[PDB]
Amino acid sequence: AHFTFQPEYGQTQKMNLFQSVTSALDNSLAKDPTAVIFGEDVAFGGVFRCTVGLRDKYGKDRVFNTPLCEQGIVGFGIGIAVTGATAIAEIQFADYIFPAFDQIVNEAAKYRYRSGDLFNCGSLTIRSPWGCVGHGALYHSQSPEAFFAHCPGIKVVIPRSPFQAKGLLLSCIEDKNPCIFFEPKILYRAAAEEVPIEPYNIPLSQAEVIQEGSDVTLVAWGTQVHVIREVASMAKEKLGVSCEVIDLRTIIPWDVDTICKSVIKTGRLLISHEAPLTGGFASEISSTVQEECFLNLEAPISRVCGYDTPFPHIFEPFYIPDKWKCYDALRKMINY
Amino acid sequence: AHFTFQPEYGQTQKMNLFQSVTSALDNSLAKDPTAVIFGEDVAFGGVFRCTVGLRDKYGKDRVFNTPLCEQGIVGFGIGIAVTGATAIAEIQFADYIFPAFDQIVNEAAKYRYRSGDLFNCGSLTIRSPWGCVGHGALYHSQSPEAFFAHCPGIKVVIPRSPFQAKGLLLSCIEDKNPCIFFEPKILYRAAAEEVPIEPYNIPLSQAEVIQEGSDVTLVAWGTQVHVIREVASMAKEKLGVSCEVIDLRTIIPWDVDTICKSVIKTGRLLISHEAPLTGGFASEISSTVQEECFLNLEAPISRVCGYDTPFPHIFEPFYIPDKWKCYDALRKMINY
């Protein structure tokens, strides 16, 4: 593996990330009698086991399979939500969210605005496996968040761990705006830690500083947070460099203030993500930070991203923005 | 109107922008017997008259209406192009390109890569009306280029005038990669100038410096080029400030070198576009320029863009990044 995972609220149990998602969905159906979960192959527990046991517990009318049609899954979910009921739609891989792009962008995101708040689909959440998995190639590896970041009216949220995933998913489910929640699939079984059994929330539009530091700010989300945590360790050890490590968590609306506050302190910023460089979300963070922290910047902001190609099968190890690529970019930024 | 249009290759005639598109399409069908043009309502000449006379001239098998289904128009066009024939698909408003987003992003863009160049759809061009029109509201005003900019394998091209539109459209048609050509519809009748009757090309991935200047670089595309040309005039007159005015022309792959060369000279950059700020293409230009021209930048790079909302009907005059908004941002950037 290219990463290493490392691990107030009542009793906890050790959960991997798929189990934390099941736990969030179970808590939601238990407390909200209107909530349903639907999509391809969810009834038997899903292709990644995220819905195991829920149809038996809550009933076939609340956890059910749809026909194989993503534009329909999202349009159907908007309509459930227009009536006020919680609709938790699954899209089987984020790579297959594109047939539903018109329903997300032209419809879900715009529903409240265009009606003057006469109608809305706030009670819709779309959850989808995301990011690279070692051998997923072009259509089981994608990270589509920058496509959605350019659409006002939706929220886009990505967790880095089991504890984070349950708390952020419950916040998505309960938020009054249509939300896309992307689950890093390479963590579904790998990442396991203590997770509260009872429901809890983590706020949206709020980054988390997971390690304080004074020389450079590193920003990432999803599995790539674990990559930059290791990069921070490598920098301390090899270079005597103190890195502030930040998980962005929500892509939009994003926490501009936490990132700028960090860069005002450190003077230096590196952003990293698996998605391609050009048009990726690091470009929005980099310009904004340049706009707000111009006087504090000691070096150009660095973006260490996937290359501008489709996601390859056999060349995956050469494609991803791994710890060596991030480390080397950091070293040059420190030397600048 | 919020803008003013201002106006080697053999005989020319005065053409507005819809007529320049017809002229490009006529020249293409004349010299390429494989070429066809299809989409909703193209047979009678189209809802914006871009195909008037072409079915009578070239035949009903070459200029024809499809059923009302954009995912089908694009998938059909990819298949024509897989056989080597030129396929010129129309999408009736860019706002309705989203049903075809999966065919563009997961299929057209990836077709050559994923087959090892055994198959391709290089001979596909998709042309679509684009940008604000005074009263188009949410679904007849959109500028979707930043959605496509994050997709390696397609080219995205936007002209500012009749002369530019014919030369860039012929380059799109003849390029060996799937291309999206966005036609600013507010210029279809408004902008008229001399246009060569016979075919000619303008290169893709090449910006044009339309006015040299020494104090600030201004970058835009489509109708917004005319806005920043006026802003340049306002700055010279009111502030004694010399602006270099650049039309980007191709969104991807974009001309990084021309923009950086200009900013190395001027020290200051303002980018403007109608599309929403967050995730818009100005963010890619701003970070890249910061990365390449860090030492030359005297002030933060400015982005003057549409607000992060859907495109409104009655509030259009308050929404667009007009000459006063760009001028004011420039004035502050000069004062910095």
Place this chain on the structure above:
Amino acid sequence: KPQFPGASAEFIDKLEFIQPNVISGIPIYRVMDRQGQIINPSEDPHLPKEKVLKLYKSMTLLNTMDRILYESQRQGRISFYMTNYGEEGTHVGSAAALDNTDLVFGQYREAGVLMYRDYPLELFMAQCYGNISDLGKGRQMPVHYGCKERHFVTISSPLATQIPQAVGAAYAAKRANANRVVICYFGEGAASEGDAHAGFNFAATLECPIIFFCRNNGYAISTPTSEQYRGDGIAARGPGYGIMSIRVDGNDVFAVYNATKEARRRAVAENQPFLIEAMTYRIGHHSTSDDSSAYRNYWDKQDHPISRLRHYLLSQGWWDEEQEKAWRKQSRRKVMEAFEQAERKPKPNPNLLFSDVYQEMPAQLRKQQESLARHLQTYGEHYPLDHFDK
């Protein structure tokens, strides 16, 4: 004998392709002839006088409003308009067969359903003018109506997107034990979209109480149906998805009513979808941006839903020329009163461009709103401020 999971069928030992019946398609259900005469007494719904008068008055008040607003657009007073000419019977015949609280999703050419549900003239005109009375806050193009109080979901321009949405709202109603049906209107061009195939199939497999109502008016802008499909219209598609289907004369308000009323009764009882294809003809231009003579009446003069209904009223002794003349004057007056009021109202405060993007206003969007306010403070003489509230 065949054992395959995917179909229930017998074997056949000879090769035989199944041919579509397109020349002799699904017949068109009719109740009254073009002279307003009931053809088959067993099919007469015998609707009471006051209700048949409401069908008629709704159609003609809509027609009066369409004529005035089309003119207003031609003068540049509103930015866009779409008329309902020729299709007024499909709207009122169907709406009269619904429960008041049944949820409606539409396309854009169904304003008679809101008129039947007593949507105020002031609110149709507020939306077209984008004025302070518009509950849509001036944000959408004209004719993009919506009303939460009358269960009419806001119209949006992207075609067919409401089809799978309507199915989800119907699934939710089933769960809620609502005893409510959802109706979803769309045209024949919209039915070519992938979202129509999504909604039809989901409604059948998830067993939803929804009526799909297709207005087949022969054209989708410039495209005749011969370039839209090659099967027997939209009705012949329903059975393929396992949907009970019917085709009606959409210029016969009673055929439309009967089919809708029976579809509603069975959809709610049985939790199953129904499809009605109402055959009609688009008398108007597609919109104010269309000059339809560029690509194409008998219909206006010889088969019009309003004329057919007027002849029925006369046959019962329920209308006459004196009444016709009085109502024409009163309807023009009511429409002109609302029109004048709408034109004199200001537009909403420009701050409303920023609300309702999300339920709350994110801090970075508030920053943009503040930036506009600062901008207008310095440069406001360059903006149409005196037309906007506050």
Place this chain on the structure above:
Amino acid sequence: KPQFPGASAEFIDKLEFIQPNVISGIPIYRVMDRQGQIINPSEDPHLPKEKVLKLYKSMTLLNTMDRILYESQRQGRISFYMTNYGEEGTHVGSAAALDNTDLVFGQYREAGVLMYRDYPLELFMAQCYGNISDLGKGRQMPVHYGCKERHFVTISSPLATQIPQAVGAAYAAKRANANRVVICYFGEGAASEGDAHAGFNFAATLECPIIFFCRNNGYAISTPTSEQYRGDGIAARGPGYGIMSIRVDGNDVFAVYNATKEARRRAVAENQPFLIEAMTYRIGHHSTSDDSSAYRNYWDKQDHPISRLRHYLLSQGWWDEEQEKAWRKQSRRKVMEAFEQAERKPKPNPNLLFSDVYQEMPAQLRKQQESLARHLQTYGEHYPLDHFDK
């Protein structure tokens, strides 16, 4: 008498919904029984011995390769695999009825069509291994085969996208006066996508020489057809679009052949689409990532296409146990020879991650390629370099 542009039909004066016939659906065309016996002599294609032996050998060489590659995946030697068990008759019966140069679009479970067209074992295995011999340059997941020389368009994972693409390639062939047909294979789950409705309707209205071939194998991963649709399968959808349609026993190579051969003849002659739904049963897991016992044989033991074909060969005197034993050994040897070669080949140069994104390589993408090369110069000890060419 009705005058409406959108349909050709008579009036009806009584209200009658059209009911779908789902319990008695479109019958399943059969030629030979489960014991390899011809049921109706008039339907026997009387294919010559060498061709029937090629159908049989193709199916069993595919089956041999599937068993070995599935095992290779379980061991971690390739990253993914999908078998063809139970569906081998649909692939070879159809491919044998095509012209060699007819263009094929598929889904991922049609490898027998390439095997029939003599695609080399070395190239199936190069693609699954991502090695230097793969003309796909190692870029896609295993089983995403393509061959320009044998007119088999590269497979892609997104379901149904090839359906409207195949229609466009068929329109182009019509224009080119090709005398060629396009065939487009997809499963019953894929047929629920909006792109299937797009392709079916376009092929009918634009009059394209295309066969739509649906493998209905009862499941789409875990989803049974009862949750996929509620009409009479996929065949009953065709006539709604004006497409000539048929349902066949997909475990009968001769029924599949006859239907494909006649559909090809008529599609090319008439420029009209045909739809064949082949009823079959997915014997394998969906893929190596699926354990199908989590959601569900008679089929493997009592109705298998390979067994049925083997019984036919015996009846003609065209096969025996000695031949069976020899071919089983020879096919295992051929597959094992290619397997060993594939495992020993290196992977392609990592530079190939950057080519063919566009035809040319844009300067900014070259800059990225150079950046990788610099990176590997310093940090290459941290990468699996000794496995990659150059």
